[PDB]
Amino acid sequence: PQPELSFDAMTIVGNLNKTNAKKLSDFMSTEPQIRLWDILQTKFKAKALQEKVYIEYDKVKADSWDRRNMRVEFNPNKLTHEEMLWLKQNIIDYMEDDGFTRLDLAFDFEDDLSDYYAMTDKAVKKTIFYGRNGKPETKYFGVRDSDRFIRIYNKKQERKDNADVEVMSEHLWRVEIELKRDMVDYWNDCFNDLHILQPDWKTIERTSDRAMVFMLLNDEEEWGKLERRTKNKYKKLIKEISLIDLTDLMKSTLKANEKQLQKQIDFWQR
Amino acid sequence: PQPELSFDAMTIVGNLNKTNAKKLSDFMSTEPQIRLWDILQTKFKAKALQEKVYIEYDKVKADSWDRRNMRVEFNPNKLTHEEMLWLKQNIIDYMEDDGFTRLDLAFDFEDDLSDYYAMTDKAVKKTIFYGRNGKPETKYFGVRDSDRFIRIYNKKQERKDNADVEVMSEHLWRVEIELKRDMVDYWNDCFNDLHILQPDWKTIERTSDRAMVFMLLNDEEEWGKLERRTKNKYKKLIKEISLIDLTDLMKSTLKANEKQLQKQIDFWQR
């Protein structure tokens, strides 16, 4: 099936007038439905819309480092159009120099991806959480504080664990692609290096090759020991080996929805 | 070599009088060298000894979980005898029902443990943090909120990352054993189920060799592809190879230091 695609988090950074700082700070105090703390004239913090939006202002940090002085954070999938309009009119519009600092792509699949092998052709860090079973439940590729980070994990299990309403599907896995700083502008093709695979090594006829791969695919630590020219050889081979690569479906769904998603972004920037 | 062993964290939980709550709350306010916040009559938080000791009191949250109402947290390796005596006299003594909630065993090794891994006789959950190189830096066995949790990680790398003074040894790895709640009393012979192992093939110097074996050990059909002259080379190699189990050295060092460690505990409970 085609995976559902959506933005899953958005950060927006901007700068705020002396006049507007207060104006906005003033406004917020009057509304009991917003939660205010860490207040000074140069500082404030806030959560709004039943704690779905984080809002932070700090000028002295902003002056200390040559940066923008207000962030707004939230997940658009959990906001109501009504709400989105409220937030734009009452917060975002009053920011200047405003743009995106974060942007997350969420591909939901109704398959089980435990059984796929997820890989980057690039030489980066990883993290794997295994279940009691010895099988993987959550995978991270890259590091969170970076231009690009990827999670692949069992959404069903994660939703169940979070006491969310249970799901009609028998399997549900997400593939989240966190784009920060300048990478946000390339969201429409950000999983070029990424592949989600599953091959059948038997059908291959070179013997040492098959062993070597089989090991790489069954002890992730063994990548750590391999010479760099070697790493590339086996990266090549892995990709070269598998029939169905879900990358292709992702790229497709992305293209199919590029225009809507694009509009959805444009909305915030006007 | 024999690994250095020590307790690496201690939590102490107790209960505090109405009288003593204030008394202590009063005492602390007078010392500018201790940092007080989140104050109510039922609540208070504090860090002392240059932020090395956390201290938290909460009556409303003690009973709401059916526990004792004050924690004191700290790493004994980073405290001065002077300091330890200060803390006992000015804090711990005024607690009643006092006992240990947490206790961590730290085995430092001057070897490289990258290729070693732990297994209980259970198939518990796991976490592995890999470096950019593809090698493992940190391994977790179990879950942190439990009677028992184990970290094995590169202390050298972790100390370097923490901007600690660099170390004369070329390798330094720790094996931390976090014991909580009732398990603390059994710090002393846990390893009937447990082994810190290196599998057969891991022990080999040679990448191609170790791959080839791993495959032979995990796919029966791969013998069928191999002329006899090869089979023997790997037959030879297999027999030639043993698992290394560090458990034994740990049990030993533990026994060797049981009495000191035991005294070191007794100190706090008087």
Author numbering:
A (entry chain A), B (entry chain C): 39 to 308
Give excerpts from the publication:
In this report we describe the structure determination of the core domain of replication initiator protein of cryptic plasmid pSTK1 (25,26) from Geobacillus stearothermophilus (RepSTK1 residues 1–269 (27), hereafter referred to as RepSTK1). This was then used to aid the structure solution of two staphylococcal Rep variants, RepDE and RepDN (containing the 21 kDa fragment of RepD fused to the 14 kDa fragment of RepE or RepN, respectively). Constructs of RepDE and RepDN spanning residues 35–314 were used for crystallisation studies, since the first 34 amino acids are predicted to be disordered and had previously been shown to be dispensable for protein function. Crystals of RepDN belong to space group I213, but the data were near perfectly twinned (refined twin fraction of 49.8%) giving an apparent space group of I4132. The twinning severely hampered experimental phasing; however, it was possible to produce some partially interpretable electron density maps using SIRAS data collected from seleno-methionine labelled crystals. Molecular replacement with the RepSTK1 coordinates was also unsuccessful, but manual docking of fragments of the RepSTK1 model into the RepDN density allowed further interpretation of the RepDN electron density maps. Crystals of both RepDE and RepDN contain two molecules per asymmetric unit as a non-crystallographic dimer and the final structural model spans residues 39–308 for all subunits. The relative orientation of the catalytic domains in RepDN is intermediate between those observed in the other two proteins. They still form a ‘horseshoe’, but are rotated 5° towards each other relative to the position in RepDE, reducing the distance between protein chains at the open end of the ‘horseshoe’ by 5 Å.
In Gram-positive organisms, the smaller plasmids often replicate via a rolling circle mechanism, a process mediated by a multi-functional replication initiation protein (Rep) encoded on that plasmid. The Rep proteins possess two related catalytic activities, a type-I topoisomerase-like cleavage activity in which they form a nick in the (+) strand at the origin of replication to initiate DNA synthesis, and a religation activity to join the ends of the parental strand that is displaced during replication. Despite low overall sequence identity, there is a high degree of structural conservation between the catalytic domains of the Rep proteins from these Geobacillus stearothermophilus and Staphylococcus aureus plasmids.
